[PDB]
Amino acid sequence: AAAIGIDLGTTYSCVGVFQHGKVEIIANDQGNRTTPSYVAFTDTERLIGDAAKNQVALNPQNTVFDAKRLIGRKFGDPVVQSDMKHWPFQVINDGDKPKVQVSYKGETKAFYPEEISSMVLTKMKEIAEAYLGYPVTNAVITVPAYFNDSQRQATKDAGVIAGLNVLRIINEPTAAAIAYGLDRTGKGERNVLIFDLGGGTFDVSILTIDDGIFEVKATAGDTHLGGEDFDNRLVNHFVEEFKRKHKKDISQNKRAVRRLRTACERAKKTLSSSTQASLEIDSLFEGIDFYTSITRARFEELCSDLFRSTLEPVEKALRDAKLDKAQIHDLVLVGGSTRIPKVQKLLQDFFNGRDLNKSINPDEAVAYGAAVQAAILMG
Ligand SMILES: Nc1ncnc2c1ncn2[C@@H]1O[C@H](COP(=O)(O)OP(=O)(O)O)[C@@H](O)[C@H]1O
Ligand SMILES: [Cl-]
Numbered sequence: 001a002a003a004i005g006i007d008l009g010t011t012y013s014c015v016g017v018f019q020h021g022k023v024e025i026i027a028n029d030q031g032n033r034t035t036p037s038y039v040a041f042t043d044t045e046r047l048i049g050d051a052a053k054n055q056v057a058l059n060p061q062n063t064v065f066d067a068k069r070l071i072g073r074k075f076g077d078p079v080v081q082s083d084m085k086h087w088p089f090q091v092i093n094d095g096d097k098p099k100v101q102v103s104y105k106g107e108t109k110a111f112y113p114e115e116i117s118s119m120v121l122t123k124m125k126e127i128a129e130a131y132l133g134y135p136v137t138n139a140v141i142t143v144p145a146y147f148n149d150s151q152r153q154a155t156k157d158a159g160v161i162a163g164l165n166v167l168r169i170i171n172e173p174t175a176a177a178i179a180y181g182l183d184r185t186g187k188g189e190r191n192v193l194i195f196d197l198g199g200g201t202f203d204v205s206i207l208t209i210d211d212g213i214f215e216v217k218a219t220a221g222d223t224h225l226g227g228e229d230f231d232n233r234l235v236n237h238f239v240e241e242f243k244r245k246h247k248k249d250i251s252q253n254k255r256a257v258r259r260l261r262t263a264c265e266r267a268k269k270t271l272s273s274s275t276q277a278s279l280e281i282d283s284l285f286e287g288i289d290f291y292t293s294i295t296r297a298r299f300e301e302l303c304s305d306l307f308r309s310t311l312e313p314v315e316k317a318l319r320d321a322k323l324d325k326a327q328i329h330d331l332v333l334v335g336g337s338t339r340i341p342k343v344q345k346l347l348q349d350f351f352n353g354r355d356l357n358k359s360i361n362p363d364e365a366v367a368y369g370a371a372v373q374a375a376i377l378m379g
Pocket of ligand 1: 034364
């Protein structure tokens with residue numbers, strides 16, 4: 001009766017299980033090894049994951065995402081007040097706690113962040129159970145190192161709502177280190193840097209590990225820098241391209257923009273493996289198809305400042321930890337955006353040619369470690 005490890009991500013979640021002496025990252029029903037942290041409400045259905053993200057352009061007011069930004073926070077939290085301004089869904093105040101408010105089956109309903117995240121966790125649980133062939137009841141769930149007691153509590157509550165006994169809540173960078181077996185070291189402090197550039201957030205963590213004991217020495221980053229911002233640079237580029245070619249501005253058609261955004265994310269992923277990608281959108285605007293392409297070099301240029309901006313938080317973290325570059329024993333890549341070759345070059349160059357740990361898909365490393373830790377806690 002295996003326990004599972006779940007990365008409850010800002011933009012994508014991932015689930016793994018340790019059995020038969022190895023971790024298996026589990027693909028969902030569509031074959032995807034990570035699942036959007038999306039929940040949608042319609043006149044007839046509640047959709048979660050791929051199904052929810054796949055109709056986000058159609059249903060912006062009732063498709064919820066970014067619940068991780070709300071979870072465990074008070075309504076009057078400056079972070080909440082700030083983030084609310086840029087979401088298409090309504091956030092309301094219930095006793096100084098935020099709720100997301102939507103239309104569902106024709107009625108106005110509101111949900112706590114931990115309710116939305118419970119739905120994502122249920123999906124991840126079900127993905128695992130489909131693979132294992134039996135019900136899962138124990139899990140380790142991960143959170144950012146900077147999460148406070150309230151954020152951790154709300155995340156655990158999300159797990160319990162999903163029918164999971166939460167064995168432990170552990171930090172995302174700790175989980176990534178565990179994935180690479182860095183917890184197995186003996187007596188003697190090792191310094192580990194986790195470079196996590198995900199879908200919506202950028203987190204640099206410096207850990208010391210000593211005889212299997214973890215300590216957080218420094219954290220740095222940007223909570224609004226991630227893969228979606230690279231998607232956005234491509235969107236703006238292609239909006240201009242469409243304008244020049246067709247003399248039409250699509251920028252205020254929310255559907256067109258959202259659909260373009262989706263196609264840009266796809267092309268971006270392809271550019272991590274190939275030096276060019278083709279974008280082909282049928283009926284992008286007024287029935288006009290948009291078939292074009294983008295090179296890796298052009299993509300890099302469009303994002304050059306954003307990519308470069310990831311290094312100063314590394315510098316800052318090193319300063320705070322009172323360590324020189326040469327004193328870092330291991331460099332660990334986390335988050336889907338670290339699969340971008342230019343990002344890898346920047347970090348490697350900054351560390352004067354050091355190896356990067358990147359053999360585990362970086363968007364799966366957190367779940368991988370959580371799965372290992374879950375197995376350890378089960379015995
Ligand atoms: N091969 C790839 N190349 C570039 N970006 C990728 C790749 N795979 C996933 N991504 C991006 O990674 C981001 C999601 O990162 P992930 O680690 O899965 O989740 P999160 O940061 O939400 O925990 C998205 O912006 C997605 O487009
Ligand atoms: Cl705990």
